[PDB]
Amino acid sequence: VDIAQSELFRGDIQWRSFHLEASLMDALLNDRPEFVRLLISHGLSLGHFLTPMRLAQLYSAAPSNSLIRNLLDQAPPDVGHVLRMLLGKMAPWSDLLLWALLLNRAQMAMYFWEMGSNAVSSALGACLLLRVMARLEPDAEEAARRKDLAFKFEGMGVDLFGECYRSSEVRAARLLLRRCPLWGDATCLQLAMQADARAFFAQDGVQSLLTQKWWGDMASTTPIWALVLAFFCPPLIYTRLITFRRCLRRWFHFWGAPVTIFMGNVVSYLLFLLLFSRVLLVDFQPAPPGSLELLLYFWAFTLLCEELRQGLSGSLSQRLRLYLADSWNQCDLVALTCFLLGVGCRLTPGLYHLGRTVLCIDFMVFTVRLLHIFTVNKQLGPKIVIVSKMMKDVFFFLFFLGVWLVAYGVATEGLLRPRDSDFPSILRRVFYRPYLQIFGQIPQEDMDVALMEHSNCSSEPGFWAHPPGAQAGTCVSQYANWLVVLLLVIFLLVANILLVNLLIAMFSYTFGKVQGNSDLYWKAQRYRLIREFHSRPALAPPFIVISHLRLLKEAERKLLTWESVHKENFLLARARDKRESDSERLKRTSQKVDLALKQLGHIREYEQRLKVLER
């Protein structure tokens, strides 16, 4: 390409749009990013150039049985349907950028986005599209390229936005993101959520933006304690403690803020558990349900109705599926279902006990759901995420321990030959009793013959001892009892020291490794939380019922221009930075030296000719 500009575009020859139209087409079809940049640089009217026939030609230029060809075959480019299918059916530059992304022409796409219009929105949109494409890509290697390119855009999109955020905080943050996007309806952030753009959400500007939305109209600096005092003293809001008809406007502003809904919900949830335990431990009786038991049933029904609303208003199948995707919503569903079984079994005349049992387990599920609170605090959210990533180590420990328990448990039981030999007890002595030995419960008197009386129990040959433990077997052989004690020593060494310490080692390593990623993941999930509570009805679950019952242009042109200017400045700064890098100076310096060497040779020749003419 350098030759073409040096020779074909030395300036000694004019050019025409029709002259360059054919060359441009060839470069696009042949993936020549440098040339297309050069040709456009030479005053080419792209808008007047592009034609639907040409656009069809480009798509037709897909490589052999490329994934895109499969989509086109399944789908006159008809691109719009393809995207609508890929997403889920929920200015020439934009079109070219879209085309480049589909064919994975990284440089072509990178260049077009640079010339694009909705730089930040386009960047994320590209990141979404590639990741979906890569996920669906069967080549298993092109996916790697698509994944790499997606990261490049996300990294570029966040880099651009940071510049915009610094320049004009209110302008960028509010209008540039909260607005509806282009080529889509879900706000720009939702595109990031779909793309799982961890890095983008990790940016300071968005985090500040989300925090602002999290607190709603209240100032984001409001102390937490101040909020709590206001919550328990509703009249207290009107004082100068909280920084932001007028009275009604402020009232809704305070009680509509996502944070206040969250805290109000949490307080209600705690009371629910407290009520649950009160019913479960005391008020639960075979007799027909009492007042409280009824209140709990009604309260739980409110939770069920609430969770139903979430899923119903997360494309019935589509929204149902995505709602089911959230882990917490899964926890809620399993919690409620068990509750229904408990009540159902509770009412039936003959299953009172089974009803209580399942409820007790059900209460355990609800309490575990309470960990969702820790996902809010910035110092705990990352911790909860990291815990999720430790399950790999725990499963290793369990399988390793499970093998050892079976190995030791069976061997010990075999040596003892206890006379009870009842299958439930056999399992107790094989798995249960050895398991507790990990935690300091070592029944020596049930295994060491030296600590047990000697008595005649069975006519079978050999000696026997009578352990005092109730579930230790009526009489255990003592043929090779020293071996039993020896295994106990080995078991404690392995299980109680090596494995437990090994597990601690794995946690220490895993925690250090995934600390960085976990932090980004939480920051990303922070948005999903805020959106969830943003739309939740104001009232709390026990009273949420009423809310359910009650439920039943030129500025944009100015904004876009503002975005483009910063993008252009950002690229120029980056491009200039590259030109000022040491390596580039070294390259340019060397080239100049060669030019100097060239002129020196010409000068040397000139001197020789002059010397000859000196005669």
Nearer to Ca ion, 5 or 329 (CB): 329
C-alpha to C-alpha distance for 548 and 306, rounded to whole angstroms: 8
Distances (CA, A) of 118 to 111, 130, 556, 560: 14, 17, 11, 7
| Pick 87 or 331: Cβ nearer Ca ion | 331
Residue 608 binds which entry of Ca ion, a second copy, none, CB below 5-8 Å type-dependent: a second copy
Task: Work out how close the CB of 467 gets to a second copy at its nearest, in angstroms, rounded to a whole number.
Answer: 17
Residue 430 CB, shortest distance to a second copy, in Å, is: 8
- By C-beta, is 12 or 582 nearer to a second copy? 582
Asked whether the beta carbons of 302 and 542 are under 8 A apart, the reply is yes
Nearer CB in complex with a second copy: 52/288: 288
Q: For residue 152, is it left (φ>0), alpha (ψ between -120 and 50) or beta? A: alpha
Residue 391 binding target from Ca ion, a second copy, none, CB below 5 to 8 Å by type:
none
Nearest residue (CB) to a second copy, 472 versus 539 = 472
What character string, x for contact with Ca ion (CB under 5 A) and - otherwise, covers 316-355?
A: -------------x--x-----------------------
431 vs 409: CA distance, rounded Å: 6
Q: How far is CA 305 from CA 109, 333, 336, 399, 541, in A?
A: 47, 11, 10, 40, 9
> For residues 169 and 460, which CB has a smaller minimum distance to a second copy in the complex?
460
Q: State the nearest-atom distance from the C-beta of 606 to a second copy, in Å.
A: 4
Q: Beta-carbon neighbour count of residue 330 at 10 Å?
A: 12
Q: Which does 135 bind (CB under 5 to 8 A by kind): Ca ion, a second copy, none?
A: none
Q: How far is the CB of 326 from Ca ion (least distance, A)?
A: 7
- Count, residues near Ca ion per rule CB under 5 A: 3
Q: Annotated binding site for Ca(2+): which residue ranges?
A: 307, 310, 329, 332
Q: Of 274 and 324, which CB lies nearer to Ca ion in the complex structure?
A: 324
Helix H or strand E encompassing 464: strand 464-466
When CB distances are held under 5 to 8 angstroms depending on the partner's kind, the choice from Ca ion, a second copy, none that residue 76 binds is none
- Least distance from C-beta 588 to a second copy, angstroms? 7
Q: Kind and range of the H or E element at 143?
A: helix 142-167
Q: Whats the size of the chain, residue-wise?
A: 615
Q: Whole-number minimum distance, CB 447 to a second copy, in Å?
A: 16
We find the least distance from the C-beta atom of residue 481 to a second copy, in angstroms, to be 17
| Closer residue to a second copy (CB): 418 or 541 | 418
Q: 360 contacts which partner out of a second copy, Ca ion, none, CB within 5 to 8 A by kind?
A: none
Binding site for a second copy (CB under 8 A): 273, 277, 280-282, 284, 286, 406, 410, 413-414, 421, 426, 460-461, 582-583, 585-590, 592-597, 599-604, 606-611, 613-614
Known binding positions for ATP: 16, 43
Q: Where are the alpha helices (DSSP H) in 10-51?
A: 17-30, 33-41, 46-49
User: Cβ of residue 406: shortest distance to a second copy, in angstroms?
Assistant: 8
Residue pair 258/538 in contact (Cβ under 8 Å)? The answer is: no
Nearest to 191 by CA among 165, 217, 153: 153
**Of Ca ion, a second copy, none, which one does residue 583 interact with (CB within 5 to 8 Å by kind)?**
a second copy
**Binders of Ca ion among 265-324, rule CB under 5 A?**
310
**Cβ at position 488, least distance to a second copy in Å:** 18
The CB density around residue 408, as the number of other CB atoms within 10 Å, is 20
* Integer Rg of the chain from CA: 36
d(CA 566, CA 118): 12
Got the DSSP string for 79-106?
Answer: HHHHHHHHHT---HHHHHHHHHHHHT-H
Output the known binding site: 16, 43, 307, 310, 329, 332
Closer residue to a second copy (CB): 568 or 607: 607
Q: In what order do the strands lie in the sheet with 464-466?
A: 453-454, 464-466, 476-477
Q: Tell me how far apart the alpha carbons of residues 427 and 473 are, in angstroms, rounded to a whole number.
A: 12
Give me the helix-helix angle, 224-232 and 258-278, nearest 10°: 60
CA gap 534, 539 in Å, rounded: 13
The enclosing H or E element of 453 equals strand 453-454
Cα separation of 145 and 106, whole Å?
A: 9
588 interacts with, out of a second copy, Ca ion, none, CB within 5 to 8 A per kind: a second copy
Could you list the beta-strand ranges (E) of 71-220. Answer: none
Which of a second copy, Ca ion, none does 402 bind, CB closer than 5 to 8 A by kind?
A: none
Q: Which does 601 bind (CB under 5 to 8 A by kind): Ca ion, a second copy, none?
A: a second copy
Q: In the complex with a second copy, which residue's Cβ is closer, 407 or 500? A: 407
- Give me the least distance between CB of 476 and a second copy, in Å please: 13
Task: Please check whether residue 449 is in contact with residue 504, taking contact to mean a CB–CB distance below 8 angstroms.
Answer: no
483 binding partner (options Ca ion, a second copy, none; Cβ < 5 to 8 Å by kind): none
Site of interaction with Ca ion (CB under 5 A):
310, 329, 332
